[PDB]
Amino acid sequence: VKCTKARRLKKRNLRTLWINRITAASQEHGLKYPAFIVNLIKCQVELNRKVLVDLAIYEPKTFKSLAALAKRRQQEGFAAALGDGKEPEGIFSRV
Amino acid sequence: WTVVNPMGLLVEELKKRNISAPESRLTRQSGSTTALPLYFVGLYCDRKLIAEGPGETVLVAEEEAARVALRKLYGFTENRRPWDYSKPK
Amino acid sequence: SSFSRAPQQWATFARMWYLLDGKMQPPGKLAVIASNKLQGLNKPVYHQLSDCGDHVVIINTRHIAFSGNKWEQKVYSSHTGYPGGFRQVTAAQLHRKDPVAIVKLAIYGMLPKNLHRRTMMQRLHLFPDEDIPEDILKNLVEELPQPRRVPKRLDEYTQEEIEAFPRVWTP
Amino acid sequence: TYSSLPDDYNCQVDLALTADGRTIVCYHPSVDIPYEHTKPIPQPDETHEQILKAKLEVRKSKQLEQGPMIEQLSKVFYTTKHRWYPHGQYHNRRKKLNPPRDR
Amino acid sequence: AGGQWRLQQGLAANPSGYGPLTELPDWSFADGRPAPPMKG
Amino acid sequence: LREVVKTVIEGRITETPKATPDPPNPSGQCPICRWNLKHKYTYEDVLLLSQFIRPYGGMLPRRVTGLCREEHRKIEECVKMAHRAGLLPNHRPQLPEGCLPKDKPKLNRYLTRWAPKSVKPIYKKGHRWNKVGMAVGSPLLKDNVCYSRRPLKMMH
Amino acid sequence: YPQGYVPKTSLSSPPWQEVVLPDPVEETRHHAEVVKRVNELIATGQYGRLFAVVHFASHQWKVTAEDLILIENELDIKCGERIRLEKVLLVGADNFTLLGKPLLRKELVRVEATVIEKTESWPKINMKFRKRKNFRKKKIIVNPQTILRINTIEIAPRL
Amino acid sequence: IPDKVFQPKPEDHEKYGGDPQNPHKLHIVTRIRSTKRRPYWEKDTIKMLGLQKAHSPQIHKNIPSVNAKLKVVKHLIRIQPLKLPQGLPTEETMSSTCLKSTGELVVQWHLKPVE
Amino acid sequence: HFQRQKLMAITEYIPPKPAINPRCLP
Amino acid sequence: RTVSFQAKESMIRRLEVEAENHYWLSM
Numbered sequence: 001v002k003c004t005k006a007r008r009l010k011k012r013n014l015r016t017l018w019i020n021r022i023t024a025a026s027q028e029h030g031l032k033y034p035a036f037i038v039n040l041i042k043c044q045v046e047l048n049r050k051v052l053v054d055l056a057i058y059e060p061k062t063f064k065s066l067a068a069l070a071k072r073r074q075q076e077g078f079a080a081a082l083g084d085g086k087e088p089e090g091i092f093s094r095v
Numbered sequence: 096w097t098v099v100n101p102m103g104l105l106v107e108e109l110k111k112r113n114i115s116a117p118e119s120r121l122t123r124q125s126g127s128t129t130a131l132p133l134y135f136v137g138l139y140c141d142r143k144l145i146a147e148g149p150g151e152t153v154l155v156a157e158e159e160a161a162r163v164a165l166r167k168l169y170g171f172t173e174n175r176r177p178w179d180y181s182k183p184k
Numbered sequence: 185s186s187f188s189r190a191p192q193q194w195a196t197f198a199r200m201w202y203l204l205d206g207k208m209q210p211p212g213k214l215a216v217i218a219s220n221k222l223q224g225l226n227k228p229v230y231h232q233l234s235d236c237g238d239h240v241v242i243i244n245t246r247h248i249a250f251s252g253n254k255w256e257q258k259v260y261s262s263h264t265g266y267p268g269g270f271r272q273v274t275a276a277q278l279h280r281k282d283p284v285a286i287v288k289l290a291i292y293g294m295l296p297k298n299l300h301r302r303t304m305m306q307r308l309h310l311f312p313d314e315d316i317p318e319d320i321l322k323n324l325v326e327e328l329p330q331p332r333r334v335p336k337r338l339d340e341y342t343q344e345e346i347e348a349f350p351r352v353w354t355p
Numbered sequence: 356t357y358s359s360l361p362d363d364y365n366c367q368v369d370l371a372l373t374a375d376g377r378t379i380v381c382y383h384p385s386v387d388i389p390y391e392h393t394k395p396i397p398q399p400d401e402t403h404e405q406i407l408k409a410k411l412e413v414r415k416s417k418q419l420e421q422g423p424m425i426e427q428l429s430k431v432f433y434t435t436k437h438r439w440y441p442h443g444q445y446h447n448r449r450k451k452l453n454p455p456r457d458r
Numbered sequence: 459a460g461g462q463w464r465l466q467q468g469l470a471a472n473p474s475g476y477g478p479l480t481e482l483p484d485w486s487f488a489d490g491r492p493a494p495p496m497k498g
Numbered sequence: 499l500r501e502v503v504k505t506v507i508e509g510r511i512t513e514t515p516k517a518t519p520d521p522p523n524p525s526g527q528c529p530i531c532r533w534n535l536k537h538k539y540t541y542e543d544v545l546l547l548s549q550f551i552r553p554y555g556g557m558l559p560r561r562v563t564g565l566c567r568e569e570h571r572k573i574e575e576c577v578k579m580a581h582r583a584g585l586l587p588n589h590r591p592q593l594p595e596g597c598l599p600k601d602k603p604k605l606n607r608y609l610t611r612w613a614p615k616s617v618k619p620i621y622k623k624g625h626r627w628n629k630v631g632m633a634v635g636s637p638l639l640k641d642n643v644c645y646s647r648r649p650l651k652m653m654h
Numbered sequence: 655y656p657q658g659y660v661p662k663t664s665l666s667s668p669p670w671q672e673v674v675l676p677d678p679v680e681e682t683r684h685h686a687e688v689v690k691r692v693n694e695l696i697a698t699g700q701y702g703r704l705f706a707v708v709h710f711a712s713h714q715w716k717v718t719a720e721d722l723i724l725i726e727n728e729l730d731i732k733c734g735e736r737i738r739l740e741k742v743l744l745v746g747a748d749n750f751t752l753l754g755k756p757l758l759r760k761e762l763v764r765v766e767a768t769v770i771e772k773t774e775s776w777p778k779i780n781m782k783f784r785k786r787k788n789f790r791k792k793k794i795i796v797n798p799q800t801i802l803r804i805n806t807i808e809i810a811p812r813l
Numbered sequence: 814i815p816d817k818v819f820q821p822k823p824e825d826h827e828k829y830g831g832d833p834q835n836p837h838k839l840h841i842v843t844r845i846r847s848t849k850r851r852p853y854w855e856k857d858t859i860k861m862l863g864l865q866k867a868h869s870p871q872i873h874k875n876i877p878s879v880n881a882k883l884k885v886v887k888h889l890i891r892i893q894p895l896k897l898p899q900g901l902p903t904e905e906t907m908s909s910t911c912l913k914s915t916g917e918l919v920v921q922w923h924l925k926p927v928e
Numbered sequence: 929h930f931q932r933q934k935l936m937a938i939t940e941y942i943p944p945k946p947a948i949n950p951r952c953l954p
Numbered sequence: 955r956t957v958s959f960q961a962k963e964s965m966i967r968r969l970e971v972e973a974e975n976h977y978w979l980s981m
């Protein structure tokens with residue numbers, strides 16, 4: 001029974017580990033975890049959390065570029081909020 | 096391939112290419128006085144870093160840095176194009 | 185990339201030494217940061233069983249600042265375990281007896297309630313004053329900015345700033 | 356200065372949407388440390404094993420007792436004495452003989 | 459997360475809803491022969 | 499401003515430096531109203547506070563300042579907090595003839611609503627549902643603009 | 655001081671600092687310049703090992719040369735037959751990477767792999783909780799499995 | 814509850830974007846909560862309406878009987894007016910239909926991003 | 929119940945903020 | 955038991971959604 005119960009919680013625990021590693025990596029670049037995910041979603045990026053951890057570990061240069069995209073979208077997102085919507089969509093915010 | 100004295104071998108290749116021998120420098124260091132020291136040694140040729148390797152001691156770091164250069168010299172980089180088994184010809 | 189397996193493992197799993205200044209800094213904010221550094225949460229590959237904690241060095245703990253009246257209102261309670269062994273001491277009294285005790289207690293409480301906490305405390309180095317052994321400085325890799333920006337006093341204010349500042353009313 | 360992140364530490368990041376706009380291209384050439392920002396190798400002219408032996412010096416009563424030996428070991432590695440104590444035969448036999456290793 | 463923003467853009471809140479990622483075939487033959495339609 | 503010179507003693511009224519011309523918001527009844535500073539000053543803003551404080555840290559009368567009562571209470575609290583935080587080294591209390599301070603270590607404090615002397619220690623902290631709350635900040639400054647998502651935690 | 659002038663202070667300005675984005679017209683020129691260099695890089699084949707992220711079934715698989723991927727279900731494909739994965743969202747090179755929105759064009763990237771083995775899962779124990787559980791209330795799960803070997807990753811300068 | 818609640822106002826029409834004339838014909842209803850711990854009459858209505866599974870799309874007519882039934886279960890459902898930008902689907906296009914979250918049922922799916 | 933307490937808070941009236949206080953009025 | 959801010963918003967959303975249901979049932 002214990003093994004059967006562990007099956008459900010095991011998947012949840014693994015997801016928690018992936019999120020924690022992303023948060024540590026994101027904070028090192030100065031980006032909070034919620035901001036990185038939201039900006040990536042705004043960029044039509046559908047990478048899963050497990051892969052996100054993988055890219056940082058083995059592709060630090062790519063992850064930094066990914067961080068810049070999230071940061072750049074965040075900058076455009078801040079500009080859009082400051083713009084109040086009157087301004088047109090940003091170059092990187094075009095969908 | 097068993098390679099002894101990488102520093103000497105690296106110099107031997109460089110002189111063949113008419114390149115100056117690199118000047119070793121300590122790029123990064125951590126826990127130098129601790130029992131678990133990490134030393135990063137970069138080989139600088141004409142004041143330009145050609146290869147850097149990690150090691151526990153400066154000698155190990157220098158030896159490791161030389162090993163990295165030898166791979167680069169022979170085009171054996173880890174990110175190099177994989178060999179092809181696809182070719183039917 | 186292209187490095188040998190063992191050196192790469194050594195570098196990735198190596199432990200770093202950090203320096204912290206406690207002068208006019210709230211221990212609670214420092215403790216939260218200290219817990220992150222001590223436990224090894226500052227690394228992207230942090231794992232619970234990887235023993236990736238880092239060394240933390242704290243100095244100027246004698247000059248820490250507590251918000252509000254926490255100096256006189258915060259009471260630390262301990263029990264010797266014998267009848268009538270209940271001891272209650274205010275924060276101000278504890279600092280007078282030991283400047284470093286308050287910082288250690290806050291960090292210990294913030295740290296996880298597990299066996300690994302005791303090992304983490306060993307890696308923690310608390311200095312009442314700026315004095316540090318030289319070898320620790322060689323071990324030290326980086327220093328961390330103070331969590332709280334220190335406000336300037338009236339004397340600290342520059343003369344040019346006074347001229348720039350306008351007179352709201354005329355006495 | 357189009358890149359939103361500093362390019363001075365890890366690698367230069369060049370962000371560029373494709374002309375069609377269907378793709379985002381990131382160019383990340385690595386950056387080497389400047390020569391002026393590095394330290395030279397120690398000019399003055401010893402193996403770590405010797406240092407380790409020196410750290411665990413045998414000074415008093417020839418070889419020291421187990422407790423002091425553990426304390427000396429604990430001090431060097433900043434560990435607790437409890438870790439160094441051995442374990443009984445029951446658990447020792449239970450240890451797996453052939454642990455799997457991948458990568 | 460992001461369901462609200464996806465709805466704002468007109469997309470499904472859950473990426474697993476109506477979209478090319480789910481609807482489109484996930485593979486094809488190396489020879490180029492189209493893969494059979496997914497049972498789902 | 500009247501100053502007495504010293505038996506025969508004579509007092510001279512002297513001209514005072516004037517406020518900077520062109521206040522940002524003319525027609526304001528109070529100087530804070532005139533300068534649009536209602537919700538943008540804090541105890542850390544010693545420069546503004548110093549203008550209304552005596553050389554030894556005493557509060558100036560409201561009538562002389564001319565500001566409204568609401569700002570008077572806010573300014574008084576801000577000044578008191580600065581004094582308790584040692585942010586006014588030049589406005590410390592006057593030594594009468596030759597007296598000297600406690601000459602004992604002084605604990606660094608800030609954001610102190612009340613005097614440390616008159617606050618007793620909280621021996622019983624309380625449990626989750628009985629936890630005691632410690633006030634931080636001043637109610638008089640509730641209206642000040644906040645740049646955080648949620649209102650600041652007055653009670654710690 | 656002019657009417658309605660507020661000097662910058664702790665509470666006058668927000669903790670965050672406003673920034674000004676670069677002008678678009680010159681920025682668009684920057685976009686093209688990077689693309690032109692990248693197209694030459696792809697044309698020159700200045701890359702070695704490549705990594706690609708492929709979405710299959712309900713999972714995303716980061717892929718590299720010689721990689722082995724196990725799929726926990728049958729595929730209906732004979733062993734030793736090469737197959738092309740059609741859903742790739744990211745591909746990486748030595749100094750450059752390509753990101754789909756949310757997927758790259760089929761022309762740019764083609765990925766092929768081969769089926770190695772069809773297998774099942776080692777028994778998994780399932781036992782629901784109930785009073786008087788008994789030892790015979792046991793069920794085993796041996797769901798199917800399949801093995802895939804990555805063969806090739808192909809890109810072209812089709813920007 | 815007074816009938817005024819279900820009597821719309823001009824401002825309400827603008828907020829919900831519903832034209833008082835040519836009222837929408839079909840309701841879109843999905844169950845978002847459980848019927849457990851609810852009275853029997855509420856349970857019966859949900860079963861009759863066919864909303865046994867949560868988040869299940871259902872096509873129903875905007876008629877008084879359906880309207881009366883929907884009002885009983887209003888708090889457990891989300892009501893959206895169906896929209897047909899391209900009109901009713903044809904027999905040939907019946908296999909190409911697709912309903913978007915916005916409430917628009919397209920009769921042709923071209924597998925091209927809206928962008 | 930927790931939900932009932934939520935209703936009580938909702939009943940609280942939301943007052944608009946005057947532009948200028950009477951003392952600081954023009 | 956003081957009400958958390960999150961709970962209040964959730965209840966408001968449910969009421970607002972129910973209000974939309976009322977309007978679409980008003981025609």
Ligand code: FES
Pocket residue numbers: 526527528529530531532536565566568569951952953
């Ligand atoms: S700000 Fe106008 S009276 Fe106070």
